TrEMBL record, chains A, B, C, D, E, F, G:
This is Ferritin homolog. Keywords: Iron, Iron storage, Metal-binding, Oxidoreductase, Zinc. It comes from Pyrococcus furiosus (strain ATCC 43587 / DSM 3638 / JCM 8422 / Vc1). Residues 1-145 form the Ferritin-like diiron domain. One of its GO terms (cellular component) is cytosol.
């Protein structure tokens, strides 16, 4: 039902999703420390969305009667030069996740694993939204090159998005 | 308003909370693998609860004009010899967390950090509920020693506690 | 718009779906004779669900301007050694249906029939559920090797699932 | 409480009913092919009803402590010369089922099996409607000899009868 | 994230979608002139639906950090010999659109562009609906060979489909 | 009911309306590319509004028992030096349409075509608003010369106008 | 306010509207006699509509400080060769009335009577509707030619339009 090769790669992705959660929580802390509460809440909601991605892997592995196994989660970076650089890193990160999803799709394909392929489909479309939504902001941060005024109003727009777990 | 030492001690506890989250997620995976859906969801909800605890620390630290630093989150155990042993490990852990809170409390009292010591009061009370609820279950597992039928019934009781994030 | 090979593979899968319906109906009559009314009703619900799958194929065929042909539905087994065994049979049957679908997928790909390959995703994803769902009960019936107490409790669980049609 | 001969004559009539469901499902495919969706849905509704008849025999058999035995369901005709021919075939089929019912009634009378003979009244009455309903359509079809405009309208009329199961 | 070759194919398709819109508009004008207001409204709604498909291409292209470019929209045909012929052209046109979708799927597979390939899935499925939809009416038009009475009626049914925009 | 000249002239105006829709759509793509969602959505709404105007000629033409003919729609411009230059073009376009309505009015008068001239009143009054609304924005853009803070605020206002179609 | 010529021209048009009412009332009796109640009620409704037109001339005359004068209302035709011929007459009459309104418009323009020319705008716009609905029906009657089944169906449609007075 799941080859050893595929199970290990899905567990590997599960771990990648969790480190993604961790990495955005890291950016949340970096944004609080700049006093940008909107930016930080956005990143906290990103963090939660990634845990959701991890749970989708967890559920899928169990549906295929496999076994989840958790690995260490590396310490993430502490700091970035500017909000723009933080979003450059988030975007570098989004692309690295897309890539790792494509690799998994190739692998399900190479192994003729239809089910796992169909499951990955949801992440292919989801990664389109992720990259786009981070790009939208990275670009706004460029267009606010030297303007604390726009930065301030950006921070306000990003506060629409809120972590659900405090509830 | 925070000494290096207190900030260090606090960012330290934040990480244990996260590791705590991570450890109960690992037991979720363990119980899910035995096909104990109730126990599994109970453990996912325990993990959310611990993410909560991490967030309180994060909030306190920024409240006191501190900086959160995130650290790596070690690999948890994959496996326990039985449901009972997982709960033994659970209880041992809670006790390990309580001890960590007392040490922090005691550190606060020593530095005369009334704010931090007051912050911690919440965790002293929470831990009481934590330990009590792990132990209740632990004891029930003993009482079901050689009874799949009781374990079956325990599993069903526990399915009442569901993690909130999926929704 | 359908090739002769496609049309054949599609009617075949339509007829396999109809035979699953009958197989599960056969299991319902088995479970009924054992007094296990919960089990028998669960199986009649699974029956109706399989007729649903057959109507899915039926519709796609007409959508692609093809012609449905109905073949004879073989006589299903009558007896099984035990509930556990009946579910093992059921599991293996679902795994057999899954592979029929992979095979249709593989045919679609060879022929470069994008429409059909695309229509099957739904079936690929449904089978992941179908197999999990059967496997969950299967596993519970093993955990209840020799104890009528549990089998009895399971029956009441499964009676939640009822066939919609009799109304 | 059921004689070996009776049980068998009951399990046979159950099968006849399923074959009926299949036959009308075949006529549905035929009408669907001609693009007569109203005739097609009418015939799917009839199929369902026939499955309903089967379940009544199934329920009776288990009340009298008998055992249900499913037999192979033969291949039904694929094609008919015309919509009218189909309904003539359907009328011929209902007359055949009615005869079947009578033969069961006589048998239960002869064996002085009151329960079974009582159970069958439902079918004796039901068959009156069935025949009458088919006859109504069959005649309407004769009346519409070489007139697609009439065929069209009849199709729109019969579309009032939707099968219940797709929902 | 989009190859120059891939972007041209996407903008090309966006243009075919828009031309499809215009084509049905041209057909709406054709039916309007015959005084068949039902057909004409149906075709306006068909048109509106194609503008939708165009927007989907537009959003995807932006989502991938590409750049839409709009090309001329060729003059559609003015007239057809008959409603039936018009529907034959719509059908033929539908088939032309699917081929172009398949060619893009192929292109995207050949480039290893999973995101675009995933984005196209939606159009593959939708084309199966489009085609079937047009076919269903085309065949009724065949069945209405030399019967204005039947034309008059389909007109009335089709009028249940109203373009959303006038309101 | 319509002279050949009037009919030709109404159809040409119909196609001018369509081209405006396409030109405003071109403008939407330009703003979208700049990452100015508010302006982009404004242009798409503007585009639908022009399809509306096209529909009014279409409707009037048929009311007078004429025939619509759809002509090609030329490729619009792709780029503009800036949001300002784009609104300037838009303003210039709007004046071009106004001038066209006047020639139509003037043509309807000289031919003593009261109905058409009456029909065009709506457009004279409409065109007064159309011009006025584009100018307001064009002037807010001068006001903003070298101030992204204002373009940003401007984008956000404009974002209140949304295309109805996607819904 | 009103030249003697204007007032006479208006009173004349008032009597023309009343005559039209009467004309449609004759057609009503003609269709009634044919046993086409739908057509007849449609004509009764059209008759009332014309009385409504007469009233707008009446009110306008008294708002301009003039005096209505009722002239006789000539005997309408009793009979037409066919439903199609009646509608050809209605259409001819609608054209006749449109001509009168244009003639009145011009006269107002001649006399530089801005108030009257402006008041006639309503009737210019109204006649467009009148002619169009009279045409839309006339065409179907042609399209029906040698088919009483369509006449029957047409008659059912027109029953939807009912005169208000009998209430
Ligand atoms: Fe993710
Ligand atoms: Fe905790
Ligand atoms: Fe199935
Ligand atoms: Fe029956
Ligand atoms: Fe399309
Ligand atoms: Fe316009
Ligand atoms: Fe009038």
């Amino acid at each position: 039902m799941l080859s050893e090769r595929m199970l290990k790669a899905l567990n590997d992705q599960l771990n990648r999703e969790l480190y993604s959660a961790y990495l955005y929580f890291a950016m949340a802390a970096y944004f609080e420390d700049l006093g940008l509460e909107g930016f930080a809440n956005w990143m906290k909601a990103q963090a939660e969305e990634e845990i959701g991605h991890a749970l989708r892997f967890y559920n899928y592995i169990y549906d295929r009667n496999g076994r989840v196994e958790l690995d260490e989660i590396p310490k993430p970076p502490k700091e970035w030069e500017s909000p723009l650089k933080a979003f450059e890193a988030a975007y570098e990160h989004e692309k690295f996740i897309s890539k790792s999803i494509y690799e998994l799709a190739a692998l399900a394909e190479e192994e003729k694993d239809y089910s796992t392929r169909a499951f990955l489909e949801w992440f292919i479309n989801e990664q389109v939204e992720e990259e786009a939504s981070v790009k939208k902001i990275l670009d706004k941060l460029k267009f606010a090159k030297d303007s604390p005024q726009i930065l301030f109003m950006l921070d306000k727009e990003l506060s629409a998005r809120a972590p659900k777990l405090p509830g």
